[PDB]
Design a protein around this ligand. Structure first.
Ligand SMILES: CC(C)=CCC/C(C)=C/COP(=O)(O)OP(=O)(O)O
Ligand code: NA
Ligand SMILES: [Zn+2]
Length: 12
C-alpha cells in the first residue's frame, strides 16, 4: 500500500 517495506505484502 505504499509503505515500501520488503518482505511483507505484495512485493513493492
Ligand atoms: C502486522 C503487519 C502485517 C504489519 C505489516 C506492516 C508492513 C511493513 C506492511 C508492508 O507494506 P508495503 O506497502 O511494503 O506492502 P506492498 O509490498 O504490498 O506494497
Ligand atoms: Na512490501
Ligand atoms: Zn505498498
Amino acid at each position: 500500500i505504499c509503505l515500501x517495506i520488503k518482505x511483507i505484502x505484495h512485493x513493492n
